[PDB]
Ligand binder design. Structure first.
Ligand SMILES: [Cl-]
Ligand SMILES: [Cl-]
Ligand SMILES: [Cl-]
Ligand SMILES: [Cl-]
Ligand SMILES: [Cs+]
Ligand SMILES: [Cs+]
Ligand code: NA
Ligand code: NA
Lengths: 67, 67, 67, 67, 68, 67, 67, 67, 68, 68, 68, 67
C-alpha cells in the first residue's frame, strides 16, 4: 500500500527544545511533501558562558512517498 | 519490603513537552494511587501545516503498590 | 591532539526541562573549565500533588582537558 | 489532551508470526477498549520435532484512555 | 492460541537481590493469576550509612491470560 | 572502493509482513538504482475492528552509489 | 542445575520469514541435540529484480547441555 | 597475538544468581579449556507457587584458543 | 535546584554480587559525600579452577553536589 | 536557527578502517555541500583467502542545510 | 536454503585495530570453512606504560554451514 | 576486594583511530594512576576539505583505586 520515508535532521535553536524541533520541521517543509510524524532521537547542545548556547535536537521525520 | 508497579502512558499536547507530560500525569492521578516518579522513554509527534501538531511523550509512571 | 573528558550530572528543577539542564550547567561551570557540549541521557522526575514536582535531566557534560 | 496507555502482551501460535500477532490482538479486544496500534518488541519461539513448535511475538499495544 | 501479559514491577529489599525479586513476585501472586516467568530489567538501590540501604530490582512478570 | 547509501522506508500492507516489505522495495525500485540489501528495523501496525488493520515494516534499504 | 547453550545461526529462504527460520532449525537439528527455543535477532535480506531475493533471519537457538 | 572465543550459556538454579552462574561455569569447564572471563547478559527465571522456581542467568564465557 | 553527579565504579568480590556492590560503596563513602543511589550497569567476572574467581559489578554511584 | 541533515553511507576499502571512512566521505563531497561531522555506526567486512577482503564502515554524515 | 553460523572471537594485537581483526580471522580459517563476513561488536584494550598495550577487537565471524 | 573507577574521555587526532586512542591515554596517564583497561564507546569525527579533519574516539578508561 502506502510507503513512507524517514530522513534524519538536527534542528538547532538558542531558545529551547520545542524551538529546535520546529526549526527542523520548518526547513523540512521547504523541500519535503506530506510530512506526517517525527521522532526525537537525541537531545544535545553546546555550552557558552551563560550556559546553554544552542540546543540541538536530532530527529527523524517521516513523510508519505507519492506513488 | 515495598513493591512498585510501572505503567507506560503516552501523554499528548499541542503546546509542548512539559504539557504532554503533565497531561499523562493528570490522567494517571485519576485511577492510580501513590504516584512517585516518571521516566520519559520517547518523544515523538505529528506534523501539521504549522509544524508540530501534537507532541507525544511516552513515559513510564512508577507508583507504590498497597499490601 | 586535544582530549576531552565527560562527566555525568543530573540537573533538577521544578520549572522545566531547559531549567533543569541550565541548573546542571550552572553548577558545572563552578568547578570545571572549558565546557564544550552536553548530551541528554535521560529525562525523569518526581510526582507531586500538582503533577510534576521536580524534573530531573541526566546529562553528560564534555569539556576540554589541559595538556 | 488525549492520553494513551500501552500494555505488553505475548501472542503465540503454531501457524506463523502474523497469526501470533492476531491472537494477542484478539484477546486484547476482549478487555481493552479503543485499541489503536501495536509495536513488535521481540520474536521468539519453542522448538519441536518438526521445527518451530510455537511462534511467540512480544508486542506492546497502545490504546486511548477514556477521559 | 495462548496470549500472555507482562507487567513491570520493582521489588525492594534490604537483604539482597534474590530477596527483592521474591518480594515483587510475592506481591504479584496476590492479584495476578498464572504467573510464569520474570525478566530482570534493572538493578539499582539506595545508599545509607552502612552502604546499601535498599536493593531495588526492576523486573517484568509474565503471566497467562485466561479465556475471557 | 565502492560506497553505498542507506535510506529508511516504511512499507505498509493489510496482508502481512512480507507484503509490507515488498511494498517498500517495490516503491524503492522506482527511484533508486542498484538496490542490494535491506534490514528490518521495526515491525509495528494499526489496529482495527478485525485486528491488524495495517502492518508497517520500517526498514533500511542499501544500494550502491555510482561514481 | 541444568545448563543451556545458545548458538547463532542465519536461516535463509526465498519463500518467507517463517521458511528462513525453519531452514535454520532444520539444519540445527542435524548436529545439535535438545533444541529448546529460538530468538530472532535480525531480519534482513537481498534484493533482486522481483523484489526480495532471499530473506535472511539471524536467530539464536538455545538447547540443553548434557551434564 | 592471542585470540579468544566466547560462547553463550544459560546457567540455571533454584538457589540464586551466583548459583546459576557457577552451574554454567561448572559445565563449561568440562568441554572448554582456558576459561578466563564471563559477562552476564540477562537475568530471568520461572515462577512457581513459592515464587522463584528457577533462576536463569544468560552469560558469555570467554576462553583462550590454542594454536 | 539541587544537582547530582554520578561516578562509575567497579566493585569486585570473591563472595557474591551483593558483596561486590558493597565493596564499591564502602570505598566510595571514603572520598564522596552525600551518596544517594546506585545503578548496576554490568556484571562480569574472572574464572578460576573453582569456577567464579572474582565477581565484578560495574555500577554508577550518584551523590548530591554542594554548591560551594 | 540552523538545521542539519544526516545520510547513512557505507564506505568500503581493502586497506583499512580509516580508508573506508575517507572513501565514503570522498564520494559524499561529490553531491553534498557543507559536510560537518560523521559518526561510525558499524564496522564489518568480507572475508577472503588472505583474511579481510574488504572493510566496510557504516557511518552517518551530518551536513548543514541551506536557506531554501 | 543455505544456513550460516556465527561465532564470536576476540582478536588481539599490539599493533592496531586492523591487525587485531586479522589475527582473529587468521586463527579462524584454521578450524572453520567457508568464512564469509565479520561484524565488529566491541573494541577494548589493555593499558601499559607506553599507552595501549594490546588492542582487543571482539567480532562475530559468519561462515556457511555444509548440509552434511 | 579491589575497586576500580572508570572515566570517560574523548581522544582526538587528525592521524587515525589508534592515534586518537593513544592521545586520550597519554593525557590520562598524567593525572590518573594504575590505568588498566579501556573500552571504546563511540567513533566519530569532523569533516574538512580533505575529508576527515579529526578523528574522535569516545572511550572509558578504567584504573584501580587505592585505599
Ligand atoms: Cl535522501
Ligand atoms: Cl495494567
Ligand atoms: Cl571525576
Ligand atoms: Cl560453537
Ligand atoms: Cs546472592
Ligand atoms: Cs589504522
Ligand atoms: Na521544553
Ligand atoms: Na510471515
Amino acid at each position: 500500500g502506502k510507503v513512507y520515508k524517514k530522513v534524519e535532521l538536527v534542528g538547532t535553536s538558542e531558545e529551547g527544545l520545542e524551538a529546535a524541533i520546529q526549526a527542523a520541521l520548518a526547513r523540512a517543509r521547504k523541500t519535503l511533501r506530506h510530512l506526517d510524524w517525527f521522532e526525537v532521537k537525541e537531545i544535545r547542545g553546546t555550552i557558552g558562558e551563560a550556559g546553554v548556547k544552542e540546543y540541538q535536537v536530532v530527529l527523524e521525520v517521516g513523510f508519505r512517498l507519492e506513488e
